[PDB]
Subunit: 246 residues, 2 copies
């Protein structure tokens, strides 16, 4: 029933040439975009090069958007993104929260501005290692998800991403069972706050050191609908991660 979603997140990475080579390899995979969404999130200044090189089957997005007051924070606004026809934005990703102290309240506000401007939003959340050790995973996730999920209107256009912070960029990936357990709870939170039909439509991705070895067991899980992929998305074998969802 629900369409899988696989996303590449190219984080502070790339040159004109490396993108050229990588896009060409991605373009060599045949998949049907009416069946599978595949989205690439390049560095801001590489967005146009990247969109120009990727075939229309690939969707594209940017990695952050501002809240939404006149005083310019130097982030890209949702209005600017719409005018450039940028289809997706990421919100709440680890680095915004870690370096820029972005809050749950900021996350909500960003989702508001994205939806107001007809952008599709990939909204990220997850617990720290300490929180997981302190047996606080569900509490954390619950608070993070309920900061924004009632704003969701069309449940094809907001994608939730569970990324435990300890898995991001570390090679330490969640087991399928660790992930599933959290996704199952996330979908229940959507059910209880937005309705059953909506909870069953919305995509909930895992991210955190997803690779060609582990992707099949993850996606097999029933409440895991695809992935946000960092390091592994910089290599040509990313195509095999996409295939895991085909």
């Amino acid at each position: 029933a629900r369409k899988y979603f696989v996303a590449a997140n190219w984080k502070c990475n790339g040159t004109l040439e490396s993108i050229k080579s990588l896009t060409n390899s991605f373009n060599n995979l045949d998949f049907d975009p009416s069946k599978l969404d595949v989205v690439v999130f390049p560095v801001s200044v590489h967005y146009d090069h990247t969109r120009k090189l990727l075939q229309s089957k690939f969707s594209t997005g940017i990695q952050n958007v501002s809240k939404f007051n006149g005083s310019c924070t130097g982030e890209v606004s949702a209005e600017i993104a719409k005018d450039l026809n940028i289809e997706y934005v990421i919100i709440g990703h680890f680095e915004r929260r870690k370096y820029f102290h972005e809050t749950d309240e900021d996350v909500r506000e960003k989702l508001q501005a994205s939806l107001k401007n007809n952008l599709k939003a990939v909204v990220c959340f997850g617990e720290s290692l300490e929180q997981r050790e302190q047996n606080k995973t569900i509490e954390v996730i619950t608070k993070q998800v309920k900061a924004f999920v009632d704003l969701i209107d069309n449940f094809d256009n907001v994608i939730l991403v569970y990324e435990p912070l300890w898995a991001i960029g570390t090679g330490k990936t969640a087991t399928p069972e660790q992930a599933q357990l959290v996704h199952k709870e996330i979908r229940k939170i959507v059910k209880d706050t937005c309705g059953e039909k909506q909870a069953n439509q919305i995509r909930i991705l895992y991210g955190g050191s997803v690779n060609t070895e582990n992707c099949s067991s993850l996606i097999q899980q029933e409440d895991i609908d695809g992935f946000l992929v960092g390091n592994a998305s910089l290599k040509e074998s990313f195509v095999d991660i996409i295939k895991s969802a085909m």
Copy 2:
């Protein structure tokens, strides 16, 4: 002699169409780029469009660059900028210091990263209303400039910008004499730390509500070498500001 430098900074705005019409009006101005530097700093995702539309006599740049640490901050790196042939970078601009708590040490590091990658740097600093009311202007400026000025190597490639914070975006522009007095003291810091020849070469710009009515009286002052212009640089009349420096 010392080459004048006028910069447009387009803060969180534009659309594809507004840039088309604005760049067109700019391109109608005949000036000699061997005699006058004119740099346009668009939003990141508008860099490509803007650069394609502006004639070669305009230089271009980005509004921020990251420090050199394995966990990506989402900012564009100096390396990426060089690979894109982005000529200039702004460092230390007010929003970074205010919204993201960017420090003088951060500014030093960004300058180090920029020069390591052959980027030319437009380095901004300035006091608050409170600091100025508390007679601390010269002390504040001095700490800010001494944070990085020693790293300067080629004194054509780093440009200093005095923007008192109370003048930025407010309409409340510094008088010629307010700015001149600071500019003299900046240039002396440079003479004392870097050498007299170097101090006479470096450009020191004023920014903070420069407009078509005030720009002539500012540029006339001996130690003001140009401008960084926000709100006024979104209008077709910005050409008249460039003309005050021709």
